[PDB]
Structures are given as structure tokens and as C-alpha cells.
């Protein structure tokens, strides 16, 4: 049953922002992390939890190749209006059976990289954000 | 080309939800009368024409009212009388019904109408059922009560003149329930009977009312089915199961002749596009709860090979990917799995004190 | 091709395959192709399995 | 339409400071960095967040050639005025399609490096600064 | 069609305008022409028997009034020609791709 | 030859034999009655001749 | 079938490079190199692989009859522009079943050799190279 051609392979992922597809990403990273108390019984040693929400987070690394990311919150930054977007992942590995496909709703990102750049270094942006709501489509 | 600058504003009725696939519910009736020839449909009680016999009438109120509900929409077609039914069984094929029976009923028409059902049902693919008197036919087409003298409203009733009862009686149930253990508030009156006959009745799949507990009530809701075949299986004998399977047959010859006949190419892209197409109908199925939750529709292998084998093409080295997607014409083969629910009918119970 | 160089009057019992392709053929030329044309769905096969 | 040519090189880059242009440059960075508090609203799990504002910083390598650093700032900073300067950046890549012109303003620098040597070690210099406000230029 | 009668020449003109009026990847089988109202009746296998003569027609069916197939008006096949040659719309990209080499 | 297109849906409960190519378990017994002469296979207690 | 006369021989083949056939050529090789990671299943103790993609590299060599390699590049490369080409080789031996013809594109090279000489030697020049696709014709 498990064979060595089964796992996922990265490259053959693709991610589409707010509808538009983007060809020049590198990772796409989406984590919840949840939210648990200490509860500590009378009578029994063994500590035990309690679980109260979750909080998202991610993060999106793509090649220089143009300005994408500029024109998406630069203005609207300065003038006190916070974006929200929506991403789309599918990772389809002709070897792996089925194809997973998720939405993350209402992405804030966290900052801008106007500029950066080195001597005899090819550009990349990174940008990490955070999320609230997910949504399956198509899980294997 | 260019007009004088004009405005318009424009009110129209809202659209709502989705159009009915299959209309269901609709009830098919003849009778023979000198007057009121022709098709004549009745919707509520009130709109009864006044020339017909009483004695019509009474059969005519008997199919209004129904099991759980009135049915949706019934069907009166009229015939002089004299003359061979064949002519007004043509006239009817062109309209559409859920259900048929003969109030007025003979041995010889009971057979012409069993063949007609069955041979429109297999040759036509054309789902119909029909309510006999006394009749041994063994396709699912045809639901045969069993029952003498029927003492409704303080008159005689014969086996013929209660399958107008009986059928819409079934008609007025819903998808989900069953006309099992549904107690009838109009008769009365049954002969007696043991209840080892009973069983031995229900066994040969005739429809019997039963006196029970309390009230009267439908024993069973088994089909005309008494030969089981190797591809026909033992649950094909229920009247539920076998509505169902209708209902989705007609709802789905629907959807491929109006969306997917002579307008896309016969690729395998398109294949998978019909394919989700499929599903997603079987999971609005599922969501209305009458099927199993994991229903599946998957490209017909062993069918597609054996015609491309036909064709003449050698299938040693092609992998199964390629096999799906070979070639085929316009020629499409699919097959799908489903699990059909079933309301409560045997409860046990062990109670440990 | 083949039939063109023989009713020409070459001889081409030691003539390779691979050299048979490109003889002399003068103005014609021979070509062959194969293609499979797609058509629109008109039959239907479902078998749901109860 | 994604190939490995439109990738941003940064030797193709350039900077501009107080007007006058700076050829002995190693790498330049500026950066937005977003403040964002984190909100819980009754009734639903996912924690959100409200953007209040956002900070600006970045940092700027150069060879040590000439003492540019010094004259500068190194006489103001005694006295107690703290200038303000104006950076340009341009990133013109042949192989990319376009370059983008990016202007940093209200910069102010945070250190000041009077001599930084080691024996058998080229000189570098490098100096964070934060700033206040930018402008786009002719994005791609 | 329209309160008028016409005889089997006269709907060639509407035959003729369906057929080039579809792009080149449908065909004209089971296409509905809400226009036409009425036809005289026809048994199903009489219509099956038609459609094997090599004939055009107009058939009944379940909805609007629509077209039966798309065939051609050959019958017999050769060992060159078989029943690909039949459909109208194979025809039609053979002899596009024809024009264009 | 060529038909009006056709869209035929046809059901069929699933049956599994699981059987392998030899086959286990058939007991053959003769024996001496007046009426019902010849192999007459059973499955069931119930379908046992009158 | 098999027999010593079927071996092809390196003395029929020809290149054709940018559209042009090249008479002054010695050898040429390309080679795909594909890259797997090593898998351990739990169970079993013999590893297993998964294939992620392949790099393509190979090699010109030619007599040096001619600046040919010059006029290709050389003023290209300063400017900052990179040429790709398309190379086409096949192999026809009248003794072996037919020839086999082959496509590389999406060349790129790896360096220059402005000049290499030496007394009472012949000169040479090679050249190697990445490629990315490539084409089968008349394959056997």
C-alpha cells in the first residue's frame, strides 16, 4: 500500500491570489495554532488541558519577477483601510492520488518590502500574514 | 443602428430555488362514460364536472384524497366504452403519470395492460407503475392488492373499485416514508382472515390489509416481484426502493439530454466534467437524505475495454490511465455505486433487569 | 515512394531502407500522415450499482 | 510566460542619497513593518486583528572608500540638530521588463561608525536608518 | 413555423442556416428549434428506420421539437470509407483542415 | 448502423461470488422416490419438491 | 539480429547549431541528470526513492577553424543579456537501422575561451552546456 512514489511532491503546487494566478511562487505555508489552558484536577497527577480558540498564521515566498505586491496594499496602507484577500492552494502530483485544494479567508499581511536587493544576489519577497477562516475543497 | 436615448424600468417575479427535475405525484385515471370524452384534469375536489355519474364520482373522490397527502395532480381520461382499451393506452403515452389503474376492469384487459407497462417499461425506458386487481405479474411495474369485499362508508366495495383507493393511497406518501403499517381511517369493515395466510400471502408478494392493532392498516408495501433472478436482488421488492430508482433514472436523462447532448466533444476532460456533474446531483440526494452519503462515480473500465476490443485495437502495453482516456467515438461509459435508505420495519429489543 | 523509384527503373534490391527515403524522387514529393478526430457526445452508458 | 531570465539581478542596481549618487554600494533594504493588536470577538473561535499603524527601517552596506558617513552627520550630531535626508532607489535589470524607481524619505540614521579595521580584512561600513514616508516611481 | 405550411424545399433554407450557424466543435444532433410547433406524427422505429436510410429529420421528443442526428446522405461504405464519414461535423473539419494545408 | 442517440440507464444490485476456480462443498446423494425423477439441486430447506 | 556491422559510428554524425550546420565539430554529448531523494518506509528495509525533476548538461567540442564561438556571444554577455539557442543532432550510419535525429533547446553555455594556443599544437575549443527540453524525430 505505501509505496515511496506516493509522497507529495512541492513543485507541482500552484497558488492563486485574490483570483489572479501567481506562476512565480517558491512556498506557500498555512498553520493554526491553537490555544490551550492548564487545568490542574484534585485527586489525579496527571495535568490536564483545556481548549479555547486558535489563531492563524502563514507565509508566502515568491521570486522578484515584478511589483505584485505594491500595488496590492501600498496605497491603501498610508491611508488607514486595511486589505483582506483570499488564497487558494492546490497541490496535484500526477504519482499521488487525489489533489488537495484549500481557501484562507481574510489574510492580513503583516508588513512591505518596498526595496531589497544585493550585488550578485538574485531578489526574492517574503511575506508573512495572518488568517480566520479555512475551507476545503477536493481533500484526498 | 443608433435610436433615441430611452430609459425603461421593468418588474418581474422573483427566481426561486431551483425548477422541480421530475414532476411527482401525478396520478393517471380512466373510466368509461358516455359523456366528458378526453383528457380531464382535476386538481382539487370543487372543480368536478357535474355530468358524470355518481357512482364515477365516488372513484373520483376515493383517488382525491391520499395516504398522507393529496396527490399533486390527478388525470381523468374518459373513453365511450364498447371498444378495445389499446386505443386510449396509445392516446396516453404521450402524457406523463406516476401511477394508472382500471376502477372498471376485466380479466382480458388486466392483461393487456400488464403487457403494455412491461413492454413500455423495458422497450421504451420509460418508468411507469400501475395498480392491478387480481393479476400474477412479476415486474416491479405493476402493485397487485388482494382484498374481497371492502366495506367503505357502509357499501360493498370489490377488489377493482378499491384499487382506486390503493392507488392513491401510495401516491400520497412522500419519498421518505412507506405506506407500511399506515393505518386506513375510511374502511371499516374486512373479512376475516388468519394470520399464517397472511404471511403465506405477503410471501407471494400480493398486497393484503391486515386488522393488526387498533385500526386497519396497509400489512406491507411489497411489489408484484416473486421470481428473483441472479441480477435482479431481493431488494427490488419494495415499492419505496423501487420509486426512488425511478425518480432518479427520469432526473437524470434529463440533465444529459438538456446539457450534455451535441454540445460538448466526447473528450476526456468533458468526461470528468460529467462525471462532477453526477456527483454533485448525488450529493444534493444525499443532502435530502434518501441515498447513502458516499456515492461514487467512477469511468466504466471492463466496458470500455471490451469495446475497444471490438474495434479491433491491442490493449497490451497501454497503462490504466491510458485506457481511460483512449479514444472511443461518440460512445460514453460510466458506472457509479450507491446505497439506497430504507425507513424502520423490524425493531428487536433485549431489556436486562 | 517506394513504387516511384521502381517505375522510374532503379534497381532496389541493395537499397537501404534509410536510403530509399532519400533518393532522388525529381519534383514529386510523398507524405503520409495520422490524425484521430474527436466528436461530440451522442450515447451514454451508466450502470449504478445498488 | 514565467521564465528564469525575469528573475531581478541586484547588480543592476543603484542608489541615490541626498541627491548625489552612491557607486560604491553593497546592498540596500527598507522595510514596513506593520503594528496590529489582536481582537477577540464573542462567539467564533478564530482570533482576529485591527492595524493601528506601521514603522519603517532599513539599512544600507557600502565599501569604505571615502568617508562619506562622516561628513554628513558627524558635526550636527554633536551640536543637537539631527538632519533628515532623502534616499532613491532603481533596480533596471535588462533581461526584466521595467525597473522600478522607489524614493525614502525623512530618513534618520542610528549610528555612526568613526573607524572599524582589522588586519588582513577589506573595510565595509553599514548603517540602519528609519523612516517615515515613501513614493512610488514608475513600478513595473 | 409561424402559422404557415411548407413543404420539404421550403425548410431548406432554415436546415441550411442551423447547420452553418454552430461553431465547429458541436454538432447539430438533439438541437431544439423552439420555432417549429407542429410535425405529422411518426412511430419511433419508423424514425430509426429513416435515420439507418441516410435521411435529415425532424423528431418528437420529450421538450421542444428538435433534430434526430446529424448523418450524411451516404450508405454504402467502401474499404476506404467508413462510417466516420457519415457524420456531418467530421466531414466539416476534414475538409477545413483540407482548405487550410 | 447508425441509430437516434441513446441514453439508456440500467440498475443492477451487486452480487459476489468470491469463488475460486475449483469448487468446495457439493454433496451428491441419490435416491429412490416414486415422482420427481432427476437431479433436482436445492439451496435452501424451503424449495424441497412436495 | 545483432551483429558487429550495427554499431553506430562517431564519424556520421553532423550539428546543426542556431539553423546552421556546423562542419568543424569533434564530439557532442547531452545527458539528463534526475534527481531523487532517499525514502525509508518503516518495515522494510531496503530504501526507496522518489523522483523530484532533472538537470540537463552537456558538451561541445570543435576544431578551431574559425572564431565562430565570438560572433555568437561575446558582445551579448557584457551587456547583460543572455542568448538561448536550439541545437539539432543526428546520427546516420548506412550500416546501422537508419539514423536517429534529436533536438536540445533552451541552450545556454557555460563560459567563453577567447584564446588558447600552444607551440607545435593544434588548437581546440569546447564548450559545455544546460539545456532544458528537448524533441525526438525520426527516433529508431
Redesign the interface.
Known amino acids: 500500500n505505501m509505496e515511496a512514489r506516493n509522497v507529495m511532491s512541492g513543485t507541482w503546487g500552484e497558488l492563486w491570489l485574490d483570483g489572479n494566478k501567481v506562476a512565480e511562487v517558491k512556498k506557500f505555508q498555512a498553520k493554526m495554532e491553537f490555544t490551550k489552558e492548564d487545568i490542574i484536577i484534585a485527586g489525579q497527577m496527571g495535568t490536564d488541558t483545556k481548549y479555547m480558540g486558535y489563531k492563524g498564521k502563514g507565509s508566502i515566498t515568491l521570486y522578484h519577477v515584478s511589483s505584485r505586491m505594491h500595488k496590492l496594499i501600498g496605497e491603501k496602507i498610508k491611508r488607514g483601510s486595511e486589505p483582506r484577500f483570499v488564497a487558494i492552494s492546490k497541490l496535484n502530483d500526477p504519482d499521488s492520488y487525489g489533489a488537495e485544494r484549500i481557501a484562507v479567508k481574510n489574510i492580513a499581511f503583516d508588513d512591505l518590502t518596498l526595496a531589497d536587493w544585493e550585488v550578485g544576489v538574485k531578489g526574492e519577497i517574503e511575506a508573512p500574514f495572518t488568517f480566520t477562516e479555512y475551507d476545503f475543497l477536493d481533500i484526498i | 443602428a443608433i435610436g433615441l436615448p430611452s430609459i425603461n424600468i421593468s418588474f418581474k417575479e422573483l427566481a426561486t430555488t431551483v425548477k422541480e427535475r421530475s414532476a411527482r405525484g401525478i396520478i393517471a385515471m380512466v373510466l368509461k362514460d358516455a359523456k366528458a370524452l378526453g383528457l380531464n384534469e382535476i386538481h382539487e375536489k370543487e372543480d368536478i364536472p357535474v355530468d358524470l355519474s355518481a357512482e364515477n364520482k365516488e372513484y373520483i373522490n376515493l383517488a382525491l384524497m391520499g395516504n398522507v397527502n393529496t396527490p399533486n395532480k390527478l388525470l381523468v381520461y374518459v373513453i365511450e366504452g364498447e371498444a378495445d382499451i389499446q386505443t386510449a393506452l396509445d392516446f396516453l403515452e404521450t402524457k406523463e403519470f406516476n401511477y394508472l389503474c382500471m376502477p372498471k376492469a376485466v380479466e382480458a384487459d388486466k392483461t393487456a395492460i400488464k403487457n403494455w407497462i412491461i413492454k413500455l417499461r423495458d422497450i421504451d ?1 420509460v418508468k411507469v407503475k400501475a395498480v392491478l386487481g387480481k393479476v400474477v405479474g412479476n415486474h416491479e411495474g405493476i402493485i397487485n392488492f388482494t382484498t374481497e369485499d371492502v366495506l367503505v362508508g357502509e357499501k360493498k366495495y370489490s377488489v377493482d373499485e378499491f384499487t382506486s383507493r390503493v392507488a392513491g393511497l401510495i401516491a400520497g406518501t412522500p419519498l421518505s416514508q412507506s405506506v407500511t403499517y399506515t393505518k386506513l381511517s375510511d374502511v371499516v369493515d374486512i373479512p376475516k382472515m388468519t394470520k399464517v395466510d397472511a404471511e403465506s400471502r405477503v410471501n407471494k408478494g400480493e398486497l393484503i390489509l391486515i386488522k393488526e392493532a387498533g385500526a386497519i392498516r396497509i400489512a406491507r408495501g411489497v411489489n408484484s416481484l416473486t421470481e428473483l433472478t ?4 431481493e ?2 421488492q419494495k415499492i419505496k426502493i423501487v420509486d426512488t ?1 425511478d425518480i ?2 427520469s432526473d ?2 434529463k440533465v ?2 438538456d446539457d ?8 476526456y476532460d ?1 468526461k470528468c466534467l ?1 462525471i462532477v456533474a453526477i456527483k454533485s446531483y448525488l450529493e444534493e440526494l444525499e443532502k435530502s437524505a434518501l441515498i447513502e452519503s458516499d456515492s461514487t462515480v467512477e469511468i ?1 473500465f471492463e ?1 470500455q475495454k471490451s469495446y475497444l476490443k471490438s474495434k479491433g485495437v491491442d490493449l497490451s502495453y497501454m497503462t490504466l490511465q491510458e485506457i481511460k482516456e483512449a ?1 472511443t ?12 435508505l430504507d425507513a424502520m420495519e423490524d425493531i428487536d429489543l433485549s431489556i436486562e433487569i
Chains 1, 4, 7 share one sequence.
Do not use: C, P
Open positions: 425506458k441472479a441480477e435482479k436482488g431488494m427490488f430508482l432518479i433514472h437524470i436523462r444529459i439530454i450534455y447532448i451535441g454540445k460538448v466533444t466526447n473528450s468533458n460529467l466504466d466496458a479514444n467515438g461518440s460512445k460514453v461509459f460510466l458506472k457509479a455505486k450507491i446505497k439506497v
